[PDB]
């Protein structure tokens, strides 16, 4: 019933400018591949993971 309060972290998303899709008669390819390498992550910068 009562409203709940808590502290949360901000989250942001980043994307490259590459767009692929499928459609009838489209010229786009169907299979794509990419990799992401993680270099440094702090497990607990704040109280939240």
């Amino acid at each position: 019933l009562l409203l709940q309060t808590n502290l949360i972290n901000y989250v942001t998303s980043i994307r490259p400018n590459i767009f692929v899709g499928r459609a009838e008669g489209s010229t786009q390819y169907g299979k794509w591949y990419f990799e992401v390498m993680v270099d440094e992550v702090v497990p607990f910068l704040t109280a939240q993971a």
Partner: protein, 783 residues
């Protein structure tokens, strides 16, 4: 959903994640450090374009590896898969950007940004006018021949300028070509191909609607040929002699005709290659049937568009030389306004707005009750100036001032003692047509006024409320001596701003809605409580007819753990099945009614809604070598179509068993074939999607069946063992509203994006933490 991988652990430094996207059968697969992860998404929608994305909080440092000249892949891609760097469009350069940002940093401060135009999956399909229709005009056959002859002369000239000479067998290295001969001396099949191509230029002109006909019968015998020097002579005696068309000038309609003839020709060639099986790619690969220019003409490089365009221009000029004459709706405007606590009811105030772009932007003053879904100035709640074309907007549009240019600053001044609003442009006071120095007069004080601005798609603007008096560029020039003060003078913190967020939300139906009325019917001896919806303006002029998304205010929550005419008291006291029904009145088309449940995360609001648009996805788990052991299906809308059950009311009933997660439906007492299965912790809201076609539309019936409890027993704890139906006031009908006001955060995360190198790829970095205190509403599961 937990997944099993060799050496499960959270993402740690030196980890490489490989993502594969296959569209032939919709699937997304992952690999971590070379080991496959036993879990795949499949059977998802294909209504848009897919892009890679990483979401992160503060304290991260990641690198994108895209292959090729960019981040080299650490592991070989699976066979048949192509690197993502090959998908870059010819007109665009690879870069890293945020997603639908409404704010960015600039030199002198924050810049507000409007909606961004995005491509669609249909933009990559070629659509030529090419139809089965054939012209074959007998009156254009002569000119077909003469056109082909001149096109050949021009082609040969272009080759010979580039060092080509005659030889009987083509040799690209020595630049020998057998077609450097008189047109009439070409092999018959080559002559015929040239004639076919000339004819198809003519037929495409006609398909584009051009009128092509002889106008000057003297023109042909007045034509002269270009006389080239002997250095253009081939060893076989052939020297090209194209027509001298220097006197020919395309009219505007003809220029347009050339621009149209080339785009269509390119699209027809593109679709022919697609039918032949080729596909678009930066890295040209003949054995792989990949071509860099295999794309529609809208998205092509200017160098080739201009090249192919010139051959068609010369074709049209040849004809002339021979004497022929040839003759969503809501995510568009983004409104920014100050907070209501800054309302001013007296004094003289000033602020500036700089137009980085020159598109659709409006700026002015608005009342606190401004509606987010109405364009500024369409009502009496705003006095705005539209700068794309000098106009003033208040309960309509009227000419005022002149259009602005890039970098122009508009100074908005309001005087509450004289009840006037003055707009200035670059320090010069704008002038009306009648000589009135004031845009608006006799404005009522009322609640007060607030600065407001609206931006169209792709528009950028800087709003300066004058917190720093030195930052103003024309305040001293015009405004200082008249007694005007900056709107935010003597203020410790920047003014908080609210923006119109286009995220659909469910809100209660207003009691005074002009079109929709909800009546609460009490339960009689033979009828249960009902909530009937009626259209109060059907049939009359100005009636509004559109898709209506309704839901009940309270959800039903499934149990945490699943098991392995007179009611029976023990069965009714031990049952976990609940029932509710919807009565569609006679006259309303069953084909326009959908009845079922929605999860709390439904924000679609589609004006052409169908059951095929419902989001769906299957999560499949397996062992190290397959052996599918779990295949769950996820969706946000579980409904049935009223058109599958076709002068009498239709009462569709819904049954949910909270102890098993099973949902079933009944049509007029007959069991339907459709059923659904849900997870233990699922919350479901009773929802109806309807297109009204009559005064009486629907009626929620909160009744019960034999040995089945009503909804109030599941919605209310105190009524868990009460079989008597109830309709407490808290239970009400909510409708889906498209737009709502949202508060802009005071601070934003600092993200650093840069190209770390050719082999290292593109690096993303974020360090500074930020935290906000979130208020969570339990029943709606949102904060």
């Amino acid at each position: 959903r937990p997944v099993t991988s060799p050496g499960q652990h959270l993402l740690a430094p030196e980890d490489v994640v490989s993502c594969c996207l296959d569209l032939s059968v919709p699937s997304i697969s992952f690999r971590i450090n070379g080991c496959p992860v036993q879990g795949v998404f499949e059977a998802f929608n294909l209504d848009g374009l897919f892009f890679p994305v990483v979401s992160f909080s503060a304290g991260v440092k990641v690198r994108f590896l895209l292959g090729g000249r960019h981040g080299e892949f650490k592991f070989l891609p699976p066979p048949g898969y192509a690197p993502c760097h090959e998908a870059v469009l010819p007109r665009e350069r690879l870069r890293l950007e945020p997603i639908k940002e409404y704010r960015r940093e600039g030199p002198r401060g924050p810049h507000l940004v409007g909606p961004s135009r995005c491509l669609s999956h249909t933009d990559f399909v070629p659509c030529p006018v090419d139809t089965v229709q054939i012209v074959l005009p007998p009156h254009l056959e002569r000119i077909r021949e003469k056109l082909a002859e001149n096109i050949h002369e021009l082609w040969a000239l272009t080759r010979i300028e580039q060092g080509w000479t005659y030889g009987p067998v083509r040799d690209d290295n020595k630049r020998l070509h057998p077609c450097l001969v008189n047109f009439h001396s070409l092999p018959e099949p080559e002559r015929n191909y040239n004639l076919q191509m000339s004819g198809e230029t003519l037929k495409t002109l006609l398909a584009l609607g051009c009128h092509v006909g002889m106008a000057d019968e003297k023109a042909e015998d007045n034509l002269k040929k270009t006389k080239l020097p002997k250095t253009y002579m081939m060893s076989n005696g052939y020297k090209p002699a194209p027509l001298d068309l220097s006197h020919v000038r395309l009219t505007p309609a003809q220029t347009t005709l050339v621009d149209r003839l080339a785009e269509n020709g390119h699209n027809v060639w593109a679709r022919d290659r697609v039918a032949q099986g080729w596909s678009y790619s930066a890295v040209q690969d003949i054995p792989a049937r990949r071509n860099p220019r295999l794309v529609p003409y809208r998205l092509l490089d200017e160098a080739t568009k201009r090249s192919n365009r010139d051959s068609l221009c010369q074709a049209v000029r040849t004809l002339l030389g021979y004497g022929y004459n040839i003759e969503s709706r809501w995510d568009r405007v983004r409104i920014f306004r100050a907070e209501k606590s800054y309302t001013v009811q007296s004094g003289r105030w000033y602020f500036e707005f700089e137009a980085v772009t020159t598109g659709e932007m409006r700026v002015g003053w608005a009342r606190p009750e401004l509606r987010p879904d109405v364009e500024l100035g369409a009502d009496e709640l705003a006095y705005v100036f539209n700068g794309h074309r000098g106009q003033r907007w208040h309960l309509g549009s009227e000419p005022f001032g002149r259009p602005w240019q890039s970098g122009d600053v508009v100074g908005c001044m309001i005087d509450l003692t004289e009840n006037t609003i003055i707009f200035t442009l670059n320090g010069e006071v704008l002038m009306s047509d009648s000589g009135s120095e004031t845009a608006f007069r006799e404005i009522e004080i009322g609640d007060g006024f607030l600065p407001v601005c609206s931006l169209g798609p792709g528009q950028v603007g800087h709003l300066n409320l004058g917190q720093d008096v030195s930052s103003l560029r024309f305040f001293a020039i015009c405004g200082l001596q008249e007694g005007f003060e900056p709107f935010a003078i003597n203020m410790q913190r920047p003014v908080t701003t609210w923006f119109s967020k286009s995220l659909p939300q469910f809100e209660p139906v207003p009691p005074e809605h002009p079109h929709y009325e909800v009546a609460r019917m009490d339960g009689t001896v033979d009828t249960p409580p009902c909530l009937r919806l009626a259209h109060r303006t059907w049939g009359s002029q100005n009636s509004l007819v559109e898709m209506l998304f309704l839901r009940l205010s309270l959800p039903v929550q499934f149990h945490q753990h699943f098991r392995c005419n007179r009611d029976d008291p023990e069965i009714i006291l031990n049952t976990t099945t609940y029932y509710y029904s919807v009565r569609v009145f006679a006259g309303q088309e069953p084909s326009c009614v959908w009845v079922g449940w929605v999860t709390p995360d439904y924000h679609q609001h589609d004006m052409n809604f169908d059951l095929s648009k419902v989001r769906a996805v299957t999560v499949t788990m397996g062992d190290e070598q397959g052996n599918v052991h779990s295949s769950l299906k996820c969706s946000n809308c579980y409904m049935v179509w009223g058109g599958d059950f076709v002068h009498t009311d239709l009462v569709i009933g819904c049954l949910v068993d909270l102890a098993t997660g099973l949902m079933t439906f009944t049509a007029n007492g007959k069991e339907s074939n459709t059923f659904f299965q849900v997870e233990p912790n699922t919350k479901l809201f009773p929802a109806v999607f309807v297109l009204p076609t009559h005064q009486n539309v629907i009626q929620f019936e909160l009744g019960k069946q034999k040995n089945i409890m009503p909804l109030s027993a599941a919605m209310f704890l105190s009524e868990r063992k009460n079989p008597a139906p109830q309709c407490p006031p808290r239970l009400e009908v909510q409708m889906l509203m498209p737009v709502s006001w949202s508060r802009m955060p005071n601070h934003f995360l600092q993200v650093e994006t840069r190209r770390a190198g050719e082999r290292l790829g593109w690096a993303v970095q974020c360090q500074d933490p930020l935290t906000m205190m979130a208020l969570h509403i339990p029943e709606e599961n949102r904060c």
